[model samples]
Target: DVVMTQSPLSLPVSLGDQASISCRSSQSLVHSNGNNYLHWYLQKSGQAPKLLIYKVSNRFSGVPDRFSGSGSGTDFTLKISRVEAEDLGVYFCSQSTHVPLTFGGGTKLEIKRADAAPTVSIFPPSSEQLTSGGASVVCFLNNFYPKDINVKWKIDGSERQNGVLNSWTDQDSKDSTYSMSSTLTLTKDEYERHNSYTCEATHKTSTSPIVKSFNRNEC
Candidate 1:
């Protein structure tokens, strides 16, 4: 399994600011087709996510070239040089060439509404002590660890079973570094509205787990 880690779980910015998200794979994702299987996506408020790039550097159908995917093996990247006004949301990376799909925790894009600067990175955002989700889970993978990682949505120590993480990635970078991300979606019935939901990141590089909490209506 591969682990993907995202920087700055939160950031401050205006409506037209540019946000960058990175995904890295543990082992090389080189596939037999000679193309690395890396993909990028955007998730907006209360809406389903959209695919932006695929195979590490190719735009998906109808996706403009401005949304570019580059890099080979494990060191691949997704760059949106000009993020559109409608592109305000969380971004992710993923790889399908391998089993047990993986994703980066994701970079959340914030429209500058208050007075502040952008946050580029927030190392190990936070962690949650769980009572019943699972001993181990592969939540997101961006070449930061050897396991699939552990990401889940929890409230009052009870795990939400419906939350799912969508992921994509490139295989050509099997020998290089590639990146991807996943979202822990909570339907109306899964948990209480405005409740605390946790997204966890696990890797061999660190001794502790990284977790980030999101309150649906606050953001």
Candidate 2:
């Protein structure tokens, strides 16, 4: 029997950040002859989980060079250098040395936000007739520090999901700030109802969300 353990339920990492995750196993991962079955994996949000480390330190084929692993029986560490936007997710350890391979409770890496809240703004469609075919409203979040951002919408206080979300980091080679945008498309009836539409931006650092709203009058 084998049991794997991981430390720090969660970590907040900024872009280009460096961090470490710990994993330990109750039994040695080494086999009687000479083989290590320790491994690491990452499950990024909305992405298929992938292997990061195998045999203790050898990176899985195609794994990013920034990710590395080290350790022996009962103790191990996963080191990440220069974290990226895509690196935000859960990291876990797995062992196949024993029957019924086991995994550690994953450690989540979240985005560390800057002190200032993001600036949010909503823009109405340029033309009224655009509503006939369907109209789109754009919500812009600008100059937010830290890459972690969540954008959502609501119509008359209820949550909505009929939109496309896109985001990009600023081109500044010296800074880690970024911006994001979310667009909501509305049917003619939904637009003419004169209901309020809101865009809410959530960041890990702030308890309150930044929001921008639009009404029929704004059209």
lDDT of the structure predicted as candidate 1: 0.56
Best by lDDT: 2
The lDDT for every candidate, in the order shown, is 0.56, 0.79
The alpha-carbon deviation from the true structure for residue 115 of candidate 2, after best TM-score superposition, in angstroms, is 2.8
Q: Any runs in candidate 2 off by more than 4 Å, and if so which?
A: 1-19, 24-28, 39-70, 79-114, 128-132, 146-152, 156-173, 204-209, 217-219
TM-score between model 2 and native = 0.56
Question: How high is each candidate's TM-score?
Answer: 0.48, 0.56
**Alpha-carbon runs more than 4 Å astray in model 1:** 113-219
lDDT of 1 at 207: 64
lDDT of 2 by residue, 1-219 (tens): 687879987787777889999998888888987777888888876787788889899988888789887888789998988988777789988998888999899998876654545788998766865646576788888776666788888878888575665757542334445667788887665676757888888886578887788666333
Clashes of 1: 56
